[PDB]
Amino acid sequence: AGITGTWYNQLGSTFIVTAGADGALTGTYESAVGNAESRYVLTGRYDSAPATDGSGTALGWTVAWKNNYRNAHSATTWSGQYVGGAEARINTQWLLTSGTTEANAWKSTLVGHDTFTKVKPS
Amino acid sequence: AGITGTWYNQLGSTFIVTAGADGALTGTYESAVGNAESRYVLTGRYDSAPATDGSGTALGWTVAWKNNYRNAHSATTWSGQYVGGAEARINTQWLLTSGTTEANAWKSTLVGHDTFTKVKPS
Amino acid sequence: AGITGTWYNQLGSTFIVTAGADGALTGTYESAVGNAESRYVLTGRYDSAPATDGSGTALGWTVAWKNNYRNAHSATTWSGQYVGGAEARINTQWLLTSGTTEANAWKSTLVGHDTFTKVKPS
Amino acid sequence: AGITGTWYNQLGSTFIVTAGADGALTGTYESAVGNAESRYVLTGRYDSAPATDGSGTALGWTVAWKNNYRNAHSATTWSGQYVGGAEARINTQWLLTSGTTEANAWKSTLVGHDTFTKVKPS
């Protein structure tokens, strides 16, 4: 429970994630709101025995932007924490790297944040 | 091939990973050499068909810092690219997130970089 | 209008800043609203001829967390952009490096994000 | 106390910087080994009473990529620590932001690292 299920960020993006008993996160990422080729494999890990003091649950997952149809030659990883209950939400920061020449290494990695909630937004 | 194998970073951390045809990354991590008290589960994704024009192969992976010995209440994700050849390496940046309370949420995430080689460092 | 003035983020921090003619940012950052021993010097840079296509105004500044009464032995740099208009704001990502040692250098840099508006939260 | 002076990274970029006794950092950056058009104002802050326990000296500075010649509608912030001695060096992580539209704001900011030494490498 808790992590398992559908999450939406505040810009029309989805991922259905199942959380395993050991600490696994596997699922998909529907980069577009719906369509079977904006969909990408997702896998990750989470603190499957988190503090009880009212801290968040630490987690991260990875998606590589290749599927059956498309390749961005790149990948994103999210790192953050899960908060349950009233405003259940996943707070993250993310890195998105592209394969580059050595020459372009330096401009290879974008950084950002993102918040997913259990209820779609506007 | 290439990616599958054992990897070392400047600080003597190690990880043994398997790269699957799909795009799966599966192995373990160790943040303190010698001992298996720092053996944690790694799962990830990589670009199973990258752009042969000389660019790196994009990938990322996650490690939840909980195993059967200790629990850290935090996870790390690595974003980066793999390069093979005589100087084979994985160059990454990473986010380390600790579960916190609303209060310390601003102190939740560590950022860094990491270069992994097939050869143990001095 | 523009950048020059008073800004607020969600957590009760303010800075007052003057946007110099040729590209300077100078001012003070108060981490606690109405608290004297929490003012620190701010210095920065911004794009003084930003585009005319809707884009934001690139900017960044720095605070070394040392003043008259306190010294954290650390520093933050904010990088982001300014948007004027009805919903004026400065969207930022920040890095916070503390002085560490060789050994502990890995755990030296906090990463995050922040948004300042001309009009207080609640 | 030896922050002021000339600094190099491996991609043949320099900055010259003067560190006042008030926490100020003023200087020039020059992404080209030589070349007036490649010069940009630099301004920052550092910790002017750093601990003497073997920790680096925390600092950061900003550069807005507009000068008397060019405008890149962006700015970099570097955050990091000065390490003196004979292996003297400034270890940083940086954030590069361009002015984007709200639409492209997600790919606004690059991340990376950089090391500077008082001596040009390879």
UniProtKB/Swiss-Prot annotation, chains A, B, C, D:
Amino-acid positions noted as binding biotin in the UniProt annotation, renumbered to this chain: 29, 40, 78, 94, 106
Subunit and interaction comment: Homotetramer.
Sequence ranges assigned to domain Avidin-like in this UniProt record: 1-121
Intrachain disulfide bonds: none
Function, as annotated: The biological function of streptavidin is not known. Forms a strong non-covalent specific complex with biotin (one molecule of biotin per subunit of streptavidin).
Keywords: Biotin, Secreted, Signal
GO molecular function: biotin binding
Motif, Cell attachment site: chain positions: 45-47
Gene Ontology CC: one annotated term: extracellular region
Protein name: Streptavidin
Annotated compartments: Secreted
Transmembrane helix as UniProt keyword: no
Recorded family membership: Belongs to the avidin/streptavidin family.
